Nucleic acid binder design. Structure first.
Ligand code: ZN
Length: 793
RNA sequence: UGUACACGUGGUAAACACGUGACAGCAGCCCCGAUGGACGGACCGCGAGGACCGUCAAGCCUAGCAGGUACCUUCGGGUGGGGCCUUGCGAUACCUGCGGGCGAACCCUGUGGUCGGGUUUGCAGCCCGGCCACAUUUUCCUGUUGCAAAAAAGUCAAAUAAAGAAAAACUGUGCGGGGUUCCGUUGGACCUGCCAGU
């Protein structure tokens, strides 16, 4: 039943989110939320035949070997290198069964000797060799088995054993400097700047330019086993290493796990499997070969520097100044791919041509299709809007911009079965830092960034049901200052440009340094600096611009968020927005956010600009005949009095729990009849001759919290008779040992600095206890609001 | 291009001349993203803004994106509204396509002519949309599927099935009971009755 699959999908996504956040977020963003809908039938019959298809690649030719031509490996594995390899352990279990524990428990020497024996024999056990493959729909509405994706997961020991081999390959034989894809530094670091400099130069000096982008799709599904084995054999690497790779690939199998249904193993006829740590290094050797097969004298002369190819993660951006120049380059790429089995998406590859014309001083754009990939024509795109050289969030071949693909991601996140805080976190730390690279490879304006920010804010407002008139700084202000900390692409793009392009001239690359001394790059740097200065405030400590201070300055100066200005001094106050979100339910988070920025609809806040009516729209609905502000509702209203005592006692119970856990003799509601009047302390506790009178207060924040704390600190500790009475009751002789103490929390859930410091210092409570008091304050306040709004008489 | 300043040349000095110059600076800050129009009237404090009533055929808005046309320039480039000032060298007219929201059609389904699309392969399939033609009405109660948060409340005819028929209060480290908030033996929420009181 559909409800059953929805149940299973929700459980699976929640478990994945609890275990590993990054993989779950990356799966949710792409669209892996609907699961499989075609079952085993008409699914194995489509994907099984496409797997055991050995490519008839002839292999590299003497010409390719000579173009390539233009020892410490297999060393015994020691125990230091095992921990020298950086491994991400928050991954999925293999089909064998060992998830992380049976592999973590074994000592290092045993694993080292096991790998040594494995390479001595050269045979990975079939049980450990076995791997599974789950299916992922591409478009949000699957229509056929060809619209899915076979993500394959291998065993943990095999991934660990290959990671050290990949590290050895990277250290022993580093790639060419042109290869800036799978590199130690950031891949698309200088490649974005080089293309921009080339485009600026070709427009400036009216130089003939043609830049083509062609991607390596099915590059996982097109490398022939024999071709790669021969390539590694002729590279000079040990022949037995190649034999081991050939034995690994020739003896391979795959299990189809669709709807938890077992399936027989299936042969694979094409090499390079997805997710293996050796795959992006082995494919780097193919990149080295294809780059070495490029024609020698061809490219674009950018300031005495010749630029021809800038390899991206899985792309190949070729450049040429002459129309005939790139045709032979493309033919060479085609023959290299065909001789190795690689296939190219003519649909997803594009060519940008730029032909100048004299006697007019303008520059002309070609429109018709001229170049081709072995006969198949290449589409010609006018504007450079295919800045999708960012890896994930795959391309659309110039059909759409970067938007209309961000909105798809937002819809995929919105429809996924996640709590309102989980979507917020996924957008915070997995979507914004993912497409932000794409908005720098070309000319950009402020309006595009502002519209992207507005769309993101609209999506977040829909997720958390906030009204329209909420301070826009609330979304982008940092957590410690009070806010959702949604990073804003309006100010983080100039920040990225300034931070990266500023250090362009310090890059080891010779091409990047040439690109640094350009005209367009410097103009963009000036624009980015201007925007950053306009959207930041200089830091007092370090004299360096920061956007967080600017967002805080706007937020604390607003009307809704003025009461939050005291939250930046005690980071515990806003510990529930981001860190402690797994302990708070779904609707609870939305209610807490609503009362946190005072988005609750009152007769004052909910009628902004629409107060042309009578006093009934402004007078308190309880008959208090005063202004109906949310502070009045939540703090001073006779209908809300019972809820106020309820919340107060809810807090005093939890703090009493804490001090009891800290081994203090507590006394609830002491009864002291002073001669002056009636004094009602909250709770007293004494230990080893010293006592304290701890009273609990939840008060508004429109005044300073510390002063309000002092107003009862002095009253309870300087009465002159009450301290003697509590000293006599507790059993301590000297009245100066006992002194008053308060726990003052603003009803939005903001600690008081003096109160928090006193409570931490006078009596020992660990951080988790103080973390939960804002939760109690917010819950009590919103329950008070619901109690008030439940009836209207 | 237009202001102001650094050096050099020449000169007895200049309120004299020229050239070269920090990416030379000097071309201020702040706020604003709502949405259908033409013609005729009733509303409003007839005031900035917000209601409604009549037709029209489809388009109407956009400081959103991309490309070209002309013009101003100065080479860098340039086209929304409002405010505070302050001196504090800038720049407009439209059409084309895409996205957004307001319209408007469209509408129970199967074949074919279709056309734009995606996806494996070499025009063989699956799926997304747009034109051209085909196939009694009202009326209550059991099963199948689309989203709400949980083993159930919403969906009484969303589509349905010789479908089976008819007409034409609360105050609480209180107490008891259950696959239900989401937590890895606890915690807030509602469901009930007693416990000392109002
Ligand atoms: Zn009141």
């Amino acid at each position: 039943t559909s409800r059953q699959k929805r149940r299973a999908e929700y459980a699976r996504v929640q478990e994945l989110y609890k275990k590993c956040r990054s993989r779950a977020a990356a799966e949710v963003i792409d669209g892996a939320c609907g699961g499989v809908g075609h079952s085993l039938e008409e699914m194995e019959t489509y994907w099984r035949p496409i797997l055991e298809r050995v490519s008839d690649a002839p292999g590299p030719t003497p010409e390719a070997l000579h173009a390539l031509g233009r020892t410490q490996l297999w060393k015994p594995i020691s125990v230091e290198e095992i921990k020298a390899s950086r491994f991400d352990w928050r991954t999925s279990p293999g089909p064998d069964g060992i998830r992380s524990g049976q592999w973590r428990a074994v000592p290092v020497h045993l694993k080292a000797e096991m790998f040594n024996a494995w390479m001595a024999r050269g045979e990975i056990p079939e049980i450990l060799r076995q791997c599974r493959t789950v299916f992922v729909p591409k478009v949000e509405r699957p229509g056929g088995p060809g619209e899915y994706r076979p993500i394959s997961i291998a065993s943990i020991p095999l991934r660990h054993f290959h990671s050290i081999l990949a590290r050895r390959l990277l250290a022993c034989c580093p790639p060419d400097a042109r290869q800036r894809g799978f590199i130690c530094a950031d891949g698309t670091l200088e490649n974005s700047a080089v293309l921009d400099a080339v485009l600026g130069d070709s427009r400036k000096k009216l130089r003939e330019c043609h830049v083509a982008v062609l991607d390596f799709a099915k590059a996982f599904d097109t490398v022939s086993h024999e071709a790669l084995v021969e390539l590694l054999r002729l590279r000079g690497m040990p022949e037995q290493f190649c034999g081991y790779i050939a034995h690994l690939y020739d003896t391979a199998s795959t299990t189809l796990a669709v709807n938890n249904e077992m399936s027989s193993p299936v042969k694979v006829g094409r090499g390079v499997r997805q997710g293996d740590p050796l795959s992006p290094i082995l494919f780097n050797v193919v990149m080295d070969l294809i780059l070495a097969s490029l024609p020698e004298r061809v490219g674009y002369r950018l300031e005495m520097e010749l630029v021809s190819a800038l390899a991206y993660a899985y792309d190949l951006v070729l450049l040429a100044g002459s129309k005939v120049g790139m045709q032979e380059s493309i033919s060479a790429v085609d023959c290299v791919g065909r001789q190795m089995g690689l296939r190219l998406n003519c649909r997803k590859s594009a060519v940008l041509s730029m032909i100048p014309d004299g006697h007019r001083k303008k520059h002309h754009y070609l429109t018709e299709r001229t170049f081709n990939i072995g006969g198949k024509p290449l589409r010609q795109v006018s504007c450079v809007e295919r800045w999708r050289y960012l890896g994930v969030d795959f391309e659309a071949s110039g059909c759409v911009t970067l938007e209309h693909s961000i909105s798809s991601a937002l819809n995929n996140i919105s429809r996924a079965p996640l709590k309102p805080q989980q979507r917020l976190e996924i957008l915070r730390a997995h979507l914004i830092p993912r497409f932000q690279h794409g908005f720098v490879l070309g000319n950009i304006s402020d309006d595009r960034l502002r519209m992207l920010d507005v769309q993101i804010r609209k999506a977040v407002g829909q997720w958390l049901r906030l009204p329209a008139d909420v301070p826009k700084a609330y979304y982008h202000a940092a957590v410690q200052d009070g806010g959702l900390a949604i990073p804003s692409v309006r100010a983080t793009i100039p920040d990225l440009i300034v931070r990266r392009f500023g250090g362009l001239d310090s890059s080891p690359w010779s091409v990047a340094r040439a690109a640094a001394k350009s005209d367009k790059i410097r103009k963009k740097l000036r624009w980015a600096w201007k925007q950053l200065r306009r959207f930041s405030r200089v830091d007092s400590t370090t004299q360096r611009p920061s956007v967080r201070l600017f967002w805080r300055e706007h937020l604390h100066a607003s009307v809704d968020g003025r009461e939050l200005r005291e939250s930046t001094r005690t980071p515990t106050s806003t510990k529930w927005i981001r860190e402690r979100c797994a302990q708070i339910t779904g609707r609870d988070f939305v209610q807490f956010v609503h009362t946190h920025i005072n988005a609750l609809p009152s007769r004052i806040r909910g009628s902004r600009g629409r107060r042309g009516g009578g006093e009934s729209s402004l007078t308190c609905r309880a008959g208090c005949k005063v202004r109906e502000t949310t502070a009045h509702i939540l703090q001073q209203c006779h209908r809300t009095h019972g809820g106020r005592i309820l919340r107060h006692n809810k807090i005093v119970s939890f703090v009493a729990k804490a001090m009891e856990e800290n081994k203090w003799t507590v006394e609830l509601e002491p009864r002291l009849r002073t001669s002056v009047g009636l004094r009602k302390p909250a709770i007293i506790a004494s230990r080893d001759g010293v006592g304290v009178i701890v009273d609990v207060q939840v008060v508004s924040g429109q005044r300073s919290l510390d002063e309000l704390h002092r107003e009862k600190r002095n009253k309870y500790g300087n009465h002159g008779e009450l301290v003697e009475l509590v000293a006599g009751r507790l059993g301590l002789p000297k009245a100066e040992c006992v002194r008053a103490t308060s726990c003052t929390i603003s009803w939005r859930g903001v600690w008081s600095l003096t109160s928090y410091k006193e409570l931490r210092s006078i009596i020992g409570l660990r951080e988790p206890t103080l973390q939960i008091v804002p939760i109690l304050a917010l819950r009590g306040s919103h329950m008070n609001w619901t109690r008030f709004n439940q009836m209207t008489s």
